[PDB]
Enzyme design. Structure first.
Site, PDB file in Angstrom:
ATOM      1  N   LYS A  54       0.822  -1.208   0.000  1.00 56.69           N
ATOM      2  CA  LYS A  54       0.000   0.000   0.000  1.00 56.69           C
ATOM      3  C   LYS A  54       0.860   1.264   0.000  1.00 56.69           C
ATOM      4  O   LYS A  54       0.403   2.338  -0.394  1.00 56.69           O
ATOM      5  CB  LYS A  54      -0.950   0.002   1.203  1.00 56.69           C
ATOM      6  N   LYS A  66      -6.805  -7.456  -1.137  1.00 53.72           N
ATOM      7  CA  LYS A  66      -6.714  -8.570  -2.072  1.00 53.72           C
ATOM      8  C   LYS A  66      -5.358  -9.258  -1.983  1.00 53.72           C
ATOM      9  O   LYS A  66      -5.266 -10.479  -2.082  1.00 53.72           O
ATOM     10  CB  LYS A  66      -6.976  -8.088  -3.500  1.00 53.72           C
TER      11      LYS A  66
HETATM   12 NA    NA Z   1      -0.361   3.666  -2.306  1.00 57.97          NA
END
Ligand code: NA
Ligand code: NA
EC number: 2.7.7.7
Length: 327
Positions: A54, A66
């Site tokens: 992320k 996911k």
């Molecule tokens: Na990001």
DNA sequence: CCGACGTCGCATGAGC
DNA sequence: GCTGATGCGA
DNA sequence: GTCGG
């Protein structure tokens, strides 16, 4: 880096990307999954968790989730389910035929047409482009070795000059950057008799000559400035026949030619970086022209361009070989 | 919260 | 038959 | 789906 690092993740994201384009018809979601797949494919570490990913630009909350699911279970339930979906997997497959987009593919599958053989039994429902796409389905998915691209370039440059020795032709794309293989041939064409502030047959007669010597074999589309079609290298006698290839030829005004060559040379990441320099320097670069802003941001008239380096000069950056334009 | 996410030539359909 | 929107690819 | 104004 080695595909074994995060290949499962990038493959998964690429699969999800394709379904967003071809089935959900959500083009922006598709580009999001690809952007995420790419930034991960360049990540030099085996990802341990969705949170780690992320951090990367392009990976948000949903893909992080996911990745967590894939890492823990080795698969993704939504992806597994849509894989088995006969309707959705068939729609996704038909879009691999050039000329058949998400809309045509869904229409086909609606009326029971799912496969290549189904398409073969139903020619009168296919348009001209789609028929060519069906005809060369396999060849079009093949890549083109640089050696063949050179042999193709030789033929294009020769016939173009033979028509009129004042033509300028340049094969762009990743080929001009030195890639060991290409997906198609992208030719950029110009003539001193063709500028912005100024015949309808400049493109036709080049295409005509390449058909005349049987290099060009088919036509997807053809107008006064843009040709999209099919070509094939001459069979080396009793040696196995070469695959049919995709070739695009476009006629660009002389005063816009080198902005065109620069753009269609790439790479995309490089172009992004490049026209973002220009902005920080007071110039706006697009496909066609380079223009100056502009105390309030009013772009002035297009600056004169006679070479690629000419553009580099305006924005106070040194000319870089196509070899070194990956980013 | 919510709009941007590239843009355009050509083929083709729809709309009139 | 002309105008313009849509699908498609890049 | 992601980013950012
Ligand atoms: Na990001
Ligand atoms: Na297609």
């Amino acid at each position: 880096p080695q595909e074994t690092l995060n290949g499962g993740i990038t493959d998964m994201l690429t699969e999800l990307a394709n379904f967003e384009k071809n089935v959900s018809q959500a083009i922006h979601k598709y580009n999001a999954y690809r952007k995420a797949a790419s930034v991960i494919a360049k990540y030099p570490h085996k990802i341990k968790s969705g949170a780690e990913a992320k951090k990367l630009p392009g990976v948000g909350t949903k893909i992080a989730e996911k990745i967590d699911e894939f890492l823990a279970t080795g698969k993704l339930r939504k992806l597994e389910k849509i894989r088995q979906d006969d309707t959705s997997s068939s729609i996704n497959f038909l879009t691999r035929v050039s000329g058949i987009g998400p809309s045509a593919a869904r229409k086909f599958v609606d009326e029971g047409i799912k496969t290549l053989e189904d398409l073969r039994k139903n020619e009168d429902k296919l348009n001209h482009h789609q028929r060519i796409g069906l005809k060369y389905f396999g060849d079009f998915e093949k890549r083109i070795p640089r050696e063949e691209m050179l042999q193709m370039q030789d033929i294009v440059l020769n016939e173009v000059k033979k028509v009129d020795s004042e033509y300028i032709a340049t094969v762009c794309g990743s080929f001009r950057r030195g890639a060991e293989s290409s997906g198609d041939m992208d030719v950029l064409l110009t003539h001193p008799s063709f500028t912005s502030e100024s015949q309808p047959k400049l493109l036709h007669q080049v295409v005509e000559q390449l058909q005349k010597v049987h290099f060009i074999t088919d036509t997807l589309s053809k107008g006064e400035t843009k040709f999209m079609g099919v070509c094939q290298l001459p069979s080396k006698n009793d040696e196995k026949e070469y695959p049919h290839r995709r070739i695009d030829i476009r006629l660009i005004p002389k005063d816009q030619y080198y902005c065109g060559v620069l753009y269609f040379t790439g790479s995309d990441i490089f172009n992004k970086n490049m026209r973002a320099h220009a902005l920080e320097k007071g110039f706006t670069i697009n496909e066609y022209t380079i223009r100056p802003l502009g105390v309030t941001g009013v772009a002035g008239e297009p600056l004169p361009v006679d070479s690629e380096k000419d553009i580099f000069d305006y924005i106070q950056w040194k000319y870089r070989e196509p070899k070194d334009r990956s980013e």
